[PDB]
Design a protein around this ligand. Structure first.
Ligand SMILES: CCCCCCCCCCCCCCCCCC(=O)OC[C@H](COP(=O)([O-])OCC(O)COP(=O)([O-])OC[C@@H](COC(=O)CCCCCCCCCCCCCCCCC)OC(=O)CCCCCCCCCCCCCCCCC)OC(=O)CCCCCCCCCCCCCCCCC
Ligand SMILES: CCCCCCCCCCCCCCCCCC(=O)OC[C@H](COP(=O)([O-])OCC(O)COP(=O)([O-])OC[C@@H](COC(=O)CCCCCCCCCCCCCCCCC)OC(=O)CCCCCCCCCCCCCCCCC)OC(=O)CCCCCCCCCCCCCCCCC
Ligand SMILES: COC1=C(OC)C(=O)C(C/C=C(/C)CC/C=C(/C)CC/C=C(/C)CC/C=C(\C)CC/C=C(\C)CC/C=C(\C)CC/C=C(/C)CC/C=C(/C)CC/C=C(/C)CCC=C(C)C)=C(C)C1=O
Ligand SMILES: CCCCCCCCCCCCCCCCC[C@@H](O)O[C@H](CO[C@H](O)CCCCCCCCCCCCCCC)COP(=O)(O)OCC[N+](C)(C)C
Ligand SMILES: CCCCCCCCCCCCCCCCC[C@@H](O)O[C@H](CO[C@H](O)CCCCCCCCCCCCCCC)COP(=O)(O)OCC[N+](C)(C)C
Ligand SMILES: CCCCCCCCCCCCCCCCC[C@@H](O)O[C@H](CO[C@H](O)CCCCCCCCCCCCCCC)COP(=O)(O)OCC[N+](C)(C)C
Ligand SMILES: CCCCCCCC/C=C\CCCCCCCC(=O)OC[C@H](COP(=O)(O)OCCN)OC(=O)CCCCCCC/C=C\CCCCCCCC
Ligand SMILES: CCCCCCCC/C=C\CCCCCCCC(=O)OC[C@H](COP(=O)(O)OCCN)OC(=O)CCCCCCC/C=C\CCCCCCCC
Ligand SMILES: CCCCCCCC/C=C\CCCCCCCC(=O)OC[C@H](COP(=O)(O)OCCN)OC(=O)CCCCCCC/C=C\CCCCCCCC
Ligand SMILES: C=C(C)[C@H]1Cc2c(ccc3c2O[C@@H]2COc4cc(OC)c(OC)cc4[C@@H]2C3=O)O1
Ligand code: SF4
Ligand code: SF4
Ligand code: SF4
Lengths: 318, 115, 156, 96, 176, 70, 215
């Protein structure tokens, strides 16, 4: 019966990823004065299925100079971690209830960078190596700031339990208390998901395809699925963190609908951002994260430590 | 136990997808097809040659800054103590020292990449 | 027979999937690449047919040879064609790629890209209009619709 | 208002010959617009216009399902237009 | 007469400084770009429904070649070889002889369509309007050999497209 | 259309609905129809184990009220 | 490579991602145009200039026509010259749209390309109406122009021209004040005036360095 819950979490996520791609293409098209997929199925609704079927019936290539074990392992790790990050999210009840769910997401997101690193290095090609090193630089840029932002926001929650965030935001959204932290968190989530304007690891215009340039067919499909699942997961995490839906214990699907709508809004905002800005330079991304975000984040961490004591507003939990 | 089952399920699903990807289609692998890609021309050197890191000092600093967040993460629980003044003083001291280290590295050109 | 019906249905499904998702390599040589861009432009919007450019040859299905192929460049075209995983298709667009064109009698020009790679569709014009290239792509889709790999395997 | 847009959609499905004709046009041309029948072709193609659309979408042809010998329900191409309707369809002239 | 594109100096008053600080900290111009894209999202796209809708063309359009006839059904070509002499790509090959009735007609008329640059010089050179570039542009083939037109193919093209070719010529012959 | 993007968004919303409601319904089904008990600390775990012991069917959610006091 | 802008083999020596040396290898689109021109008549060699720079086709036609007219000691009629200047400016609009949008696309902003290529399509329509070809017109000839304008072309050119400034304004809204675009463009590839003159630069590559020169 827990296996059924696992499947009911895994299969819909993959379906949403598949259709996210269609949504992504259509939104970009209409923002570019065109239509996007509207032939393969009514309103392009069968286009993701055709893409999935085409990719998995195409020949997978194993490069001659590549390291076989890491080359095959990296996409498996990417997709498995992308699926695993969903289990502690309360919608409004988590599949897995952790005392420290936030730390769990932090650690697993930190371990998801190795799929790009091992993939790029094991491809044994120059563009893949450049993509992997760009991933190293990206993580060095965003990690500390993201962690300190998370700590500063959760100081008003009282714990690292994700469900408690629903109780914290029963009357007001946390974005009205920490909007300066919310903006930096949103930018850091763009940087963490390798999304425009921070898509340096792929860098199509600069690096052809980046870390996955040598991947074809099914493994490439899994890398794409992992990336889009990460998009949806991170936006759901942001919606839980800063826009708390009201929960009725006898009426939980109201919370589920509200949370899904907020997550879709944030994902559509991601797609909107991709269509509006030029790409950063990765040294410029590091300088942005270390010279602007880091000092403000440190100051706001001090402020959000002092404020609950200042006003006698410390949250309940130990 | 449930988390172990979830991890096993995810890894099994990914591995099964890899197996179908590699065993369903028809493979025609020859030496030209599997050669490394460098935009149509052969690579000059190896991809296993050293690749300079211009952000090496920032990379080293990242280790100490990463341990600082590990130091700072128990603050939600620390805010429940009776000696609130002491805990606040120590938390502010830790953050001030982190900010001072960042300022020192910034002023001495430690954040500029090597040319 | 039941097996023949099953292989025919699976054949139709695979053909539909392949023709409905055709990914050309981001690859242009000369004047014809401008009309290829105009085919990708909003007026024609090839993306609505499921046709998306991708830079890497490993993630591509179609090579549109759009422009003159010179002797100096032919090995690179052959190499990026060889690095395409199968099934792969080649469209020869324009007079220069089809047969040499204006530069047929040149010391430095390959008289048609079909001397280097096998070609599925030839799109005439100097340049072909973006509408003509779209017609060629839909003709390639129809040709993919006609192919029967599973039936041939079954009748073996 | 939005209700008028919904009513426009409802009259669009109504004016395509009912529900099955609506689905036929949607799955055959990926378009459900209604236009004045300019004329019919001797091979079965039908030609419509609507001058309220912008230039390019103001003339169109619903192809026949049965050409010389082949089934053209799904397999259609621009080469099936005869030369006179070819001249009209590409806006080389205003007169049908 | 010249103008400068990047020779402006920012205002240093407190209000301007605070406005620039607000732009830096709250990302006003980025929201402006987002607003531009959002505005485009609600416009009607410029895409047409090919192949059911076609792009506009002109009576001067240069497409597939055709050989024409007089209203009596006699061919217009007299084998003068002016089109062959003017062809910049040497795409036309002509052989001629006296016909059985003494007429000056071709026995070979080939156009290599993979050599042709579709410049229309041949139809300018023709003194009897015998060779024309028609309006057809959807004649992609599956083989290279299908694009090597002989006299039968061109005569067939003329017979097939004459109804539109004559109307196109009637609408443009006063500009020639 | 711009409203042609809506069907795909609707499909994504329907897919994203399923995990939360599936979790809620499975929790109700496997916990006596009254929500899954949360044990973040050992006191709550002790309460759950005591509930399982006094239930007589080895199920914590089987609740014994004031009908067990003779 | 998408950023190669066609057939260019740029061999680069890098230290990390820092560029130590650039070596452009060209000739992947050398078709031997000049020898072929030596094998043609003056009218037969005109369409080669269409295919030299396939974004500024009529400007190349105009340059070749001016050279041949100077060698012939003849003079084009005034209406031909006005048509030449008008279509040269339309061609300049086409070329600048292509250049700016492909530059932005290489940087990472892919949206203005689609906005401006519809205007490019309309100008292609003007080309086709005047000549019967959307790109390679062969319209400007060493004696003037091949054909007169159709009887309603000027109205359509006016209708297009009175709406283009708003498209430029939208492009500038996207790019001009964007801090990301400025970061990717400001102080990048700086060339001095004297270096630009000695290296043989022309056009914008001079005017960007402050040199006041327009032919
Ligand atoms: C106790 C000992 C443990 C025994 C290990 C299992 C038996 C060893 C042999 C199989 C492993 C590799 C397979 C192989 O070499 O076939 C090549 C085979 C043919 O090779 P070839 O083309 O002829 O020539 C290749 C050349 O020789 C050159 O090719 P190459 O350079 O690529 O060869 C290198 C390869 C060759 O193998 C070796 O060199 C010797 C094997 C020693 C490996 C042990 C190192 C210790 C690492 C840590 C311990 C891990 C746990 C182990 C204990 C498990 C107990 C339950 O070594 C490896 O790379 C091993 C990496 C596997 C570790 C997986 C860990 C996942 C990390 C994810 C993140 C962590 C999450 C948090 C926790 O290629 C294939 O068949 C295609 C796919 C093969 C790999 C598929 C995926 C890997 C298989 C699962 C590994 C274990 C994962 C669990
Ligand atoms: C959530 C709000 C969605 C409501 C909505 O889409 O209203 C569209 C409606 C039409 O806006 P529009 O596309 O700018 O107007 C163009 C003509 O209405 C174009 O009108 P038309 O002559 O092409 O009529 C075609 C007709 C039906 O056309 C169709 O069959 C395609 C729509 C089916 C998609 C499923 O349009 C509809 O009834 C679809 C409206 C929404 C159904 C989805 O906009 C509003 O009423 C404003 C309400 C909120 C907008 C923010
Ligand atoms: C500016 O141009 C560009 C675009 O714009 C047109 C793009 O879209 C774009 C992105 C590429 C697109 C063409 C999207 C391609 C979509 C995927 C690659 C297909 C992957 C979809 C499947 C593999 C997901 C799984 C599908 C199943 C149905 C899920 C169910 C799983 C079972 C176990 C159940 C790029 C790179 C681009 O450059
Ligand atoms: C969506 C995620 C969940 C999916 C759930 C299902 C999991 C499916 C498992 C994934 C693999 C899918 C592969 C589908 C094709 C089968 C490939 C292989 O198994 O068949 C052949 C296996 O046969 C071998 O040649 C040897 C056969 C016998 C020798 C060892 C097997 C001994 C078993 C005993 C059989 C006797 C009868 C048993 C009755 C039960 C190998 O052929 P090969 O060309 O290499 O590979 C290319 C396959 N092509 C041709 C289709 C492209
Ligand atoms: C005599 C030497 C002075 C000059 C030499 C300087 C060399 C030493 C460096 C600094 C000396 C300070 C260390 C003193 C030990 C601190 C512990 C003690 O003083 O009490 C604490 C008082 O600490 C307070 O926070 C104030 C002192 C903190 C001073 C701020 C940091 C300044 C240090 C800077 C020097 C270090 C090197 C340079 C760093 C920049 C907490 O008391 P309280 O919590 O009630 O009770 C705890 C017991 N309970 C839990 C059972 C209830
Ligand atoms: C439980 C699931 C397990 C497997 C998972 C895989 C997903 C299932 C497969 C999805 C099926 C959807 C494909 C059907 C789409 C057909 C659409 C139709 O329009 O195509 C027509 C023809 O359709 C095809 O001929 C047949 C398609 C399907 C044939 C058999 C399908 C059997 C699938 C059963 C599942 C098998 C999976 C086995 C593994 C378990 C002609 O269209 P076309 O000419 O192109 O377009 C022209 C465009 N115009 C009209 C504008 C001019
Ligand atoms: C039905 C057919 C079943 C055959 C099974 C054989 C398995 C195998 O290794 O085959 C190698 C096979 C095919 O190679 P070829 O010989 O080139 O193609 C043959 C087709 N003609 O290659 C593969 O696909 C490798 C498959 C991957 C192995 C599956 C298990 C991988 C386990 C990964 C563990 C690491 C997980 C890391 C993430 C965990 C972190 C939380
Ligand atoms: C990779 C590392 C995976 C990390 C797993 C973290 C899971 C987690 O945090 O949940 C903790 C969870 C609940 O604890 P709390 O809710 O915080 O408090 C108790 C009150 N209910 O505790 C557990 O269930 C722990 C169970 C054991 C952990 C599983 C360890 C698995 C490690 C990897 C094994 C896989 C094979 C090893 C090789 C892999 C690569 C070859
Ligand atoms: C994640 C979403 C997608 C997941 C993947 C699910 C795919 C579902 C649909 C499967 C499509 C059916 C297989 C089609 C591709 C098979 C590969 C192929 O085309 O090879 C054809 C090949 C032709 O080779 P030959 O004629 O002998 O000689 C050629 C060399 N001279 O013939 C075959 O071997 C195919 C035989 C039957 C294929 C198996 C079909 C059974 C269904 C597979 C479902 C997979 C589930 C696991
Ligand atoms: C990516 C989509 C939106 C468009 C843009 C584009 C294509 C297809 C191919 C290419 C491309 O842009 C790149 C960069 O700009 C030029 C400019 C060229 O000449 C102006 C040229 O000629 C071969 C080639 C190119 C590249 C390449 O071939 O569709
Ligand atoms: S066929 Fe004509 S338009 Fe195409 S590349 Fe060759 S010269 Fe340029
Ligand atoms: S159109 Fe030009 S290239 Fe083609 S046959 Fe006529 S003269 Fe020769
Ligand atoms: S087609 Fe015209 S120009 Fe050519 S040989 Fe015949 S009559 Fe002379």
């Amino acid at each position: 019966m827990f296996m059924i819950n696992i499947l009911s979490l895994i299969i819909p996520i993959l379906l949403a990823v598949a259709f996210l791609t269609l949504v992504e293409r259509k939104v970009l098209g209409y923002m570019q004065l065109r239509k996007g997929p509207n032939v393969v199925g009514p309103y392009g609704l069968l286009q993701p299925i055709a893409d999935a079927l085409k990719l998995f019936t195409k020949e997978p290539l194993r490069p001659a100079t590549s390291s076989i074990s890491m080359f095959i392992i990296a996409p498996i790790l990417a997709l498995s971690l992308a699926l695993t990050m969903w289990v502690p999210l309360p919608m409004p009840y988590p599949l897995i209830n952790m005392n420290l769910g936030v730390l769990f997401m932090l650690a697993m997101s930190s371990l998801a960078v190795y799929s790009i690193l091992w993939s790029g290095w094991a491809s044994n090609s120059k563009y893949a190596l450049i993509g992997a090193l760009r991933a190293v630089a990206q993580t060095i840029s965003y990690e500390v700031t993201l962690a300190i932002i998370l700590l500063s926001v959760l100081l008003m929650n009282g714990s690292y339990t994700l469900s408690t965030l629903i109780t914290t935001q029963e009357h007001i959204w946390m974005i009205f208390t920490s909007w300066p932290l919310a903006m930096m968190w949103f930018i850091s989530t763009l940087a963490e998901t390798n999304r425009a304007p921070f898509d340096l690891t792929e860098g199509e215009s600069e690096l052809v395809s980046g870390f996955n340039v040598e991947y074809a067919a099914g493994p490439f499909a899994m890398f794409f699925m992992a990336e889009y699942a990460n998009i949806i997961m991170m936006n759901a995490f942001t919606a839980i963190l800063f826009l708390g839906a009201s929960h009725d214990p006898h009426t939980p699907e109201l919370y589920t609908i509200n949370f899904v709508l907020k997550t879709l809004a944030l994902t559509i905002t991601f797609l909107w951002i991709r269509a509006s800005y030029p790409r950063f330079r990765y040294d410029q991304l590091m300088h942005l994260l270390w010279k602007s975000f880091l000092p403000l984040t440190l100051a706001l961490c001090m402020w959000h430590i002092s404020l609950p004591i200042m006003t006698a507003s410390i949250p309940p939990q130990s | 136990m449930n988390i172990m089952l979830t991890l096993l399920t995810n890894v099994t699903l990914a591995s099964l997808l890899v197996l179908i990807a590699f065993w369903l289609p028809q493979l025609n692998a020859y030496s030209e097809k599997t050669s490394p890609y460098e935009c149509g021309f052969d690579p000059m050197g190896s991809a296993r040659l050293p690749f300079s890191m211009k952000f090496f000092l920032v990379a080293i600093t990242f280790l100490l800054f990463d341990l600082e967040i590990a130091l700072l993460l128990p603050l939600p629980w620390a805010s429940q103590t009776n000696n609130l003044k002491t805990m606040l003083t120590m938390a502010l001291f830790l953050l001030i020292l982190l900010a001072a280290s960042l300022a020192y590295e910034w002023t001495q050109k430690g954040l500029e990449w090597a040319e | 027979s039941r097996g023949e019906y099953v292989v025919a249905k699976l054949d139709d499904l695979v053909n539909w999937a392949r023709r409905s998702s055709l990914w050309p390599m981001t690859f242009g040589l000369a004047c014809c690449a401008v009309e290829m861009m105009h085919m990708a432009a909003p007026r024609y919007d090839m993306d609505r047919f499921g046709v998306v450019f991708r830079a890497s040859p490993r993630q591509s299905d179609v090579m549109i040879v759009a422009g003159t192929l010179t002797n100096k460049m032919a090995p690179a075209l052959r190499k990026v064609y060889d690095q395409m995983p199968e099934p792969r298709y080649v469209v020869s667009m324009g007079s220069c790629a089809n047969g040499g064109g204006y530069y047929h009698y040149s010391y430095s020009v390959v008289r048609g890209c079909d001397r280097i790679v096998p070609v599925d569709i030839y799109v005439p014009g100097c340049p072909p209009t973006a509408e003509a290239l779209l017609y060629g792509i839909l003709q390639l889709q129809r040709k993919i619709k006609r192919e029967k790999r599973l039936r041939i395997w079954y009748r073996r | 208002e939005l209700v008028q847009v919904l009513r426009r959609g409802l009259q669009q499905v109504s004016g395509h010959g009912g529900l099955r004709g609506y689905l036929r046009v949607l799955f055959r041309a990926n378009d459900v617009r209604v236009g004045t029948l300019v004329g019919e072709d001797k091979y079965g193609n039908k030609y419509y216009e609507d001058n309220k659309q912008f230039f390019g979408r103001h003339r169109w042809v619903i192809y026949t399902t049965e050409m010389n010998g082949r089934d053209t329900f799904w397999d259609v191409d621009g080469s099936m237009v005869p030369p006179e309707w070819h001249r009209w369809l590409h806006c080389m002239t205003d007169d049908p | 007469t010249y103008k400068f594109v990047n020779m402006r100096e920012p205002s240093m008053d407190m209000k301007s400084v605070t406005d620039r600080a607000a732009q830096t900290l709250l990302w006003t111009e980025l929201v402006r770009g987002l607003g531009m894209t959002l505005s485009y999202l609600f416009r009607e796209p410029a895409t047409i429904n090919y192949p059911f809708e076609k792009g506009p063309l002109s009576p001067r359009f240069r497409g597939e070649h055709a050989l024409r006839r007089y209203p009596s059904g006699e061919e217009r070509c007299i084998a003068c070889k002016l089109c062959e002499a003017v062809c910049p790509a040497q795409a036309i090959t002509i052989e001629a002889e006296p016909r059985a009735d003494g007429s000056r007609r071709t026995t070979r008329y080939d156009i290599d369509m993979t050599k042709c640059i579709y410049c229309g010089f041949c139809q300018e050179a023709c003194p009897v309007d015998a060779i024309v570039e028609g309006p057809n542009f959807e004649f992609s083939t599956e083989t290279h050999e299908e694009l090597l037109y002989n006299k039968e193919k061109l005569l067939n093209n003329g017979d097939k497209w004459e109804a539109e070719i004559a109307a196109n010529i009637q609408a443009d012959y006063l500009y020639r | 259309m711009w409203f042609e993007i809506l069907p795909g968004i609707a499909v994504m919303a329907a897919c994203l609905f399923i995990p939360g409601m599936a979790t809620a319904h499975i929790h109700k089904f496997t916990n006596g129809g009254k929500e899954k008990r949360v044990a973040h600390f050992s006191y709550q775990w002790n309460l759950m184990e005591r509930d399982r012991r006094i239930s007589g069917v080895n199920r914590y959610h089987v609740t014994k009220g004031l009908e067990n006091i003779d | 490579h998408p950023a190669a802008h066609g057939v260019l083999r740029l061999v680069m020596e890098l230290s990390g991602e820092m560029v130590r040396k650039c070596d452009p290898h060209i000739g992947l689109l050398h078709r031997g145009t000049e020898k072929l021109i030596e094998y043609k008549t003056y009218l037969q060699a005109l369409p080669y200039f269409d295919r030299l720079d396939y974004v500024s086709m009529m400007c190349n036609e105009q340059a070749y026509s001016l050279a041949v007219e100077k060698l012939l000691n003849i003079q084009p009629p005034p209406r031909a010259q006005w048509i030449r200047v008008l279509f040269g400016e339309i061609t300049r609009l086409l070329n600048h749209i292509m250049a700016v949008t492909t530059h932005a696309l290489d940087i990472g902003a892919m949206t203005p390309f689609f906005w401006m290529f519809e205007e490019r399509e309309k100008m292609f329509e003007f080309y086709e109406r005047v000549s019967g070809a959307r790109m390679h017109a062969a319209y400007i000839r060493p004696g003037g122009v091949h054909q007169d304008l159709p009887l309603g072309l000027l109205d359509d050119i006016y209708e297009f021209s009175k709406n283009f400034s708003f498209r430029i304004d939208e492009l500038e809204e996207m790019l001009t004040n964007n801090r990301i675009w400025r970061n990717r463009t400001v102080d990048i590839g700086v060339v001095t005036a004297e270096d630009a003159l000695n290296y043989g630069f022309s056009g914008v590559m001079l005017r960007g360095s402050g040199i006041q020169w327009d032919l």
